[PDB]
Design a protein around this ligand. Structure first.
Ligand SMILES: *[C@](O)(C(=O)N1CC(C)(C)C1)[C@H](C[C@@H]1CCCNC1=O)NC(=O)[C@@H]1[C@@H]2[C@H](CN1C(=O)[C@@H](NC(=O)C(F)(F)F)C(C)(C)C)C2(C)C
Ligand SMILES: *[C@](O)(C(=O)N1CC(C)(C)C1)[C@H](C[C@@H]1CCCNC1=O)NC(=O)[C@@H]1[C@@H]2[C@H](CN1C(=O)[C@@H](NC(=O)C(F)(F)F)C(C)(C)C)C2(C)C
Lengths: 306, 306
């Protein structure tokens, strides 16, 4: 039993992390095959980052201007290009520990593990959700840029996130590994703020299923509701609409517990209107929206990776 | 910025996990050098586990009775002994990926990462505290036994926990890697329950410091208090006493924020007496006691491992 926020094991990703230095700027890079991927603002100074011309700064760099270091070894750059906000450095050595991997662009609502790195060395690992406003709520300091988020599927790492920047309210923004930002953020030290965020409804329901599985059932009421009705009540508590696709995705949890999605929707509608009344669910005093249905099944069935 | 529950990167431990099968029982083992360590109840059936004579069952086993498997490879056992509740299987092969490591017995209050495994393969990683009643609040299913908890210090893994059992209320109990249980639990399917738990005061204060560092300061009041007074108020909310050692351990956080431990103690005493009043700290609606002072510094300074 028990229900924890739980990240994917990081080992496959650890063996891909490098330090990338250009001038005085040092940040982390991802070494896959014979390419190092990092944020393009590695080629900036403090001055530069207020309004940088990245194509211009990069013109003026030679391969030797990029120190890439993998513990004790220093990799020699033999090529450099820019794809959107990502810099690609061709190195002379293929990473022997490159895992099976893919590049994905995740959807708002989806979770992943972040491997927080400083100076190309791992600090720690935690789980995050891509919020509906295209931010994440991470823990990142100076030097963390180039840290990556990932999902593991059996043996194959899907990289979906690279860390670039921090926004007001101390939430975080970044790119896919093709260098396209999630959301409307630019890699420029300029005033930018996140849109107001919503609660990911399907994830809250997934967490309610996890609660029931773990025996926490005080909140199950005896009513049903319609999808239509549920959505109207949830509209006012700033919950995203639940679509029929979402209902279908909750099918496994519904089936494993014998609670129709719409009975659970009934129970949540009550919690939103009456609040939690001095009671916790799975240890928590707030409703959690950072567990997907797959995460719950993963944790409550025992899905495993190598 | 930001503050997350964050585990140590798991890679060094991943390369030590094996599947250990004896008869129909399969659970996880830890392969260090040429020894596999696992819970001794691998040698039991369902029948057995109500009241097992472990010395007796083990007498009757040959080395060949132990299948040890490391992905595709099968290791040949060439020796077996029992140390307390841990079984030690000498294998014919040393693990090439054995990291620098130590065996530690942690103290109540201390945190570690758990690498949850099924069939000797990692499912995921999360952070836990050894609670004062010598339990942890994990996520563990059937097959998880032998999963280990660890701290990383630079390059050296300190294993402190191996998973054995689950108790009423769905909390968890286990041994150090020398096979001594934490707390008064026995490895026997018998009615056993955890003592009522306390809140780890020093950890709550460490979390308050993290809050301030992250800018969440609404709860700082303008008073001091004495250690004596603080402890009396905390006695009734089921907080452990704060000793002078604890005060000394909070020194770095106190120094980095310029808030005396006893000013912070003043602020906590208020929160305990007046409650949180519909407000969160670092996202949380409850006070958190599962971050040590070292964890906070680690996360808020950027300590890093390889
Ligand atoms: C990242 O670039 C990094 O780790 N380093 C750059 C140096 C060499 C200093 C180390 C850095 C990570 C953030 C730093 C503050 C704490 N948390 C972080 O995640 N990213 C940046 O500093 C980032 C780069 C320029 C400005 N950045 C940035 O994040 C700004 N944010 C904004 O301007 C905002 F619009 F609010 F998003 C702050 C420094 C936080 C003000 C660029 C975006 C290119
Ligand atoms: C662990 O032994 C394991 O993963 N497996 C044994 C098999 C082969 C079935 C796979 C197992 C882990 C727990 C299983 C329930 C869910 N969570 C777990 O962590 N441990 C046990 O089953 C454990 C062994 C016998 C009885 N165990 C146990 O945990 C009991 N608990 C108690 O008796 C209690 F006193 F409450 F602690 C339950 C099965 C949960 C009732 C032994 C203790 C040797």
């Amino acid at each position: 039993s028990g229900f924890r926020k739980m990240a994917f094991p990081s080992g496959k990703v650890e063996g891909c992390m490098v330090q990338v230095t250009c001038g005085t700027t040092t940040l982390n890079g991802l070494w896959l095959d014979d390419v190092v991927y990092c944020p393009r603002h590695v080629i900036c100074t403090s001055e530069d980052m207020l309004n940088p011309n990245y194509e211009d700064l990069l013109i003026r760099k030679s391969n030797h201007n990029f120190l890439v270091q993998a513990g004790n070894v220093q990799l020699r750059v033999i090529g450099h290009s820019m794809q959107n906000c990502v810099l690609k450095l061709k190195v002379d050595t293929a990473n022997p520990k490159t895992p099976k991997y893919k590049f994905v662009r995740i959807q708002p609502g989806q979770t992943f593990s972040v491997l927080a790195c400083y100076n190309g060395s791992p600090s720690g690992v935690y789980q995050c959700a891509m919020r509906p406003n295209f931010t994440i709520k991470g823990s990142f300091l100076n030097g963390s840029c180039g840290s990556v988020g990932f999902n593991i599927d059996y043996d194959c790492v899907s990289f979906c996130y690279m860390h670039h920047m921090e926004l007001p309210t101390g939430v975080h923004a970044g790119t896919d590994l093709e260098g396209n930002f999630y959301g409307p953020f630019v890699d420029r030290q300029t005033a930018q703020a996140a849109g107001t965020d919503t609660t990911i409804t399907v994830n809250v329901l997934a967490w309610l299923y996890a609660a029931v599985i773990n025996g926490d059932r005080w909140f199950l009421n005896r009513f049903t509701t319609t999808l239509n009705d549920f959505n109207l009540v949830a509209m006012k508590y700033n919950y995203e609409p639940l679509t029929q696709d979402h209902v279908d995705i909750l099918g496994p949890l519904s089936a494993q517990t014998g609670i129709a999605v719409l009975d659970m929707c009934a129970s949540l509608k009550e919690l939103l209107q009456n609040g939690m009344n001095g009671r916790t669910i799975l240890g928590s005093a707030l409703l959690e929206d950072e567990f997907t249905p797959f995460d719950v099944v993963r944790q409550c069935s025992g899905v495993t990776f190598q």
